[PDB]
């Protein structure tokens, strides 16, 4: 029984809440949007 078991297993399982928008370009264009 180790004191950091819960902490470590919480952290290794953690995923960033807004990960799906970290790669999304802020500025876009009309031509680019249509292309999407």
């Amino acid at each position: 029984s180790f004191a950091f078991d819960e902490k470590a297993r919480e952290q290794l399982s953690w995923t960033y809440p807004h990960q799906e928008v970290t790669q999304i370009r802020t500025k876009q264009s009309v031509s680019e949007i249509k292309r999407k």
Binding site: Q11, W14, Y16, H18, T22, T26, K27
Partner: protein, 347 residues
């Protein structure tokens, strides 16, 4: 008119301009143009912030511009954009060719003209010459008037400069000719009239930029300058050792230009530590960083790493903890380096 928004950083001089522009946009969607003049590294930021208003969700009367972009638009209305553009490398190549046939006329740079790094050095020097309102005639004036060595190298530079301006005449456009062409086309630009123009993010201006600035003082209805300092004097230039010497000197420099045209001016001083209200340590810094009898932990941490690798691997853990426990986001964190080349490839 003219306005002066002054105050030490941490005081929402930057947010005040935004909320002002946002409100002027709320009152009138199709009013007279609101021009935001920031450095090229600040354009995207302001474009992203000005559009973050839930009720409007964007801008149309207000445009965020750099000097170059403003020059491009104004010249797209007045004229001059049809003239071919040259890159710094193209200018270097022109200087190479010019050196090859004027090498025997030099007084000092006759042996150094064999090197390829030299043409880059000349390129940078001539660039600075255009950026500070100096035509070949002025360089010749300096040459005619280690003064010996300086006069001789200015003589060589004179030759290269003159021949460059002679070769680019009635055919090409230099990279540093946009702002000069801008300053002399603003008067005959109708869209400029009655438009608010806001300056923020600049620490100083080149004389070439100063020409455009004062021209905007003339032909624009209103203009506000946001400078980061602390009660700067309009009578004398700041001391060399004091903190705000750049912004202070520009603050001084603008006043003579404003009082010369005799335009009514407005004051603005910001006292509040708006940014550092939540945490104690940050506020003290802004006010008494400069202070020599420095008066004497949660937010301010001084870290020592074994190397740059351990430094970055440590900063990674801190950022991770900040978004994991402290509920921060990655968009909140900033990482600054005086010499980015020492960390980039490892970052």
């Amino acid at each position: 008119g003219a306005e002066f928004l002054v105050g030490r950083s941490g005081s929402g001089k930057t947010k005040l301009i935004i909320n002002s522009i946002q409100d002027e946009l709320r009152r009138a969607p199709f009013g007279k143009p609101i021009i935001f003049l920031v450095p090229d590294q600040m354009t995207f930021l302001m474009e992203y912030e000005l559009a973050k208003t839930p009720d409007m969700g964007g801008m149309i009367r207000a445009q965020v511009f750099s000097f170059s972009r403003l020059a491009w638009r104004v010249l797209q209305h007045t004229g001059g954009m049809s003239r071919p553009f040259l890159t710094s490398t193209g200018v270097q190549m022109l200087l190479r060719k010019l050196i090859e046939e004027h090498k025997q006329e030099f007084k000092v740079y006759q042996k150094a003209s064999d090197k390829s790094g030299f043409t880059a050095q000349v390129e940078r020097m001539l660039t600075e010459f255009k950026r500070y309102c100096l035509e070949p005639e002025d360089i010749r004036r300096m040459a005619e008037s280690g003064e010996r060595v300086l006069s001789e190298k200015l003589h060589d530079l004179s030759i290269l400069y003159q021949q460059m301006e002679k070769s680019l005449a009635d055919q090409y456009l230099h990279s540093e000719d946009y702002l000069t062409l801008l300053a002399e086309h603003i008067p005959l630009a109708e869209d400029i009239k009655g438009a608010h123009i806001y300056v923020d993010g600049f620490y100083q201006f080149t004389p070439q930029e100063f020409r455009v600035l004062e021209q905007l003082m003339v032909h624009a209805e209103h203009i506000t300058f946001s400078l980061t300092a602390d009660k700067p004097s309009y009578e004398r230039e700041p001391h060399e050792l004091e903190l705000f010497r750049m912004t202070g000197k520009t603050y001084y420099r603008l006043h003579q230009k404003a009082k010369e045209l005799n335009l009514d001016i407005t004051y603005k001083e910001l006292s509040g530590t708006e940014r550092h209200t939540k945490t104690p340590e940050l506020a003290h810094l802004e006010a008494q960083y400069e202070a020599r009898p420095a008066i004497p932990q949660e937010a301010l941490t001084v870290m020592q790493a074994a190397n740059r690798r351990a430094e970055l691997e440590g900063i990674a853990r801190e950022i991770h903890a900040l978004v994991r426990e402290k509920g921060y986001r990655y968009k909140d964190v900033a990482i600054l380096a005086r010499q980015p080349e020492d960390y980039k490839d490892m970052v």
